[PDB]
Design a protein around this nucleic acid. Sequence first.
RNA 1: ACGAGAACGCAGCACCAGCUGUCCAACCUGAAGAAGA
Length: 297
Amino acid sequence: MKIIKLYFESPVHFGEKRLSESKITFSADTLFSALMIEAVGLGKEDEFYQLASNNLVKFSDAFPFIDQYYYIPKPMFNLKLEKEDENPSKAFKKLLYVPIDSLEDYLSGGLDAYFERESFNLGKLALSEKVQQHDFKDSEPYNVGTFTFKENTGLYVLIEQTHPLLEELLENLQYSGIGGKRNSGYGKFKFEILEDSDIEDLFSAKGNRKILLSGALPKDAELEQALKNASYLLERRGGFVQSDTYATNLVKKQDLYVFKSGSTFENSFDGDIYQVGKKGNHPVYKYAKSFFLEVSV
RNA sequence: ACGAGAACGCAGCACCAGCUGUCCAACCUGAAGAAGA
């Protein structure tokens, strides 16, 4: 609908559990954490939480885009309707991201397996050997896993009904970086809200199977409804609370397990914004609302 | 309230030691002060 295209001017660290490795995309909870930190910066975190918790600003995570080819993580189809031909094997296993316009072609079969992966080339992971210099003690060598994008390549975020407050927050997020070592020379980007036309048709479509496009956790009421004929995958969303005004020390947060952003469901559920920091003096939130892409097998 | 925050790939270290721009080789060859002053 409103593809937010992020163009990075420096390698990024989007780490999953440790500093030595980086991954190529950031999730929607990472982006909501960044925007909430910005909103606390300019004093309107309450309105941002109200907007996001009232579904007025719901977004997917960051997917790759290459030369105006919007990519999506390989949807978790049950592949019950492809054993007749093609390769129902590890051929469709190294394939990580498929284009979002060619999903119905992929879903019905006929998309090349080998061709896509070499076609899908956006930069490469990098080592960044660093140290903590000590005058008389020994220096502390550490490395930061980073990732540099190509020239005409970056990440894109699906947002429904962009908001003036969200536009104000994304301007502030340009100059504070996104990702791991952003205060070091890594997090840096410029964005374009970039309304799009061939994409809004995919989300105005209909179909039996729904593709989850944001790492989401169902409410306790609809977990049973969503966990029926579903092909999902959990992932722990924890780590350390990034704030200088929380718990007067460096404390971890309650690990949250959410459905991955490639899972497929027959029942649409609306996730929740989860309180994962309670013992501290501000609400640490895990954005886990649901963003879907309905298809028909 | 971004698997986070904080963290110099940094410190010491002579592009240096030995080595004739030397050896051989002729500034050499060929050539009248006459003639009617």
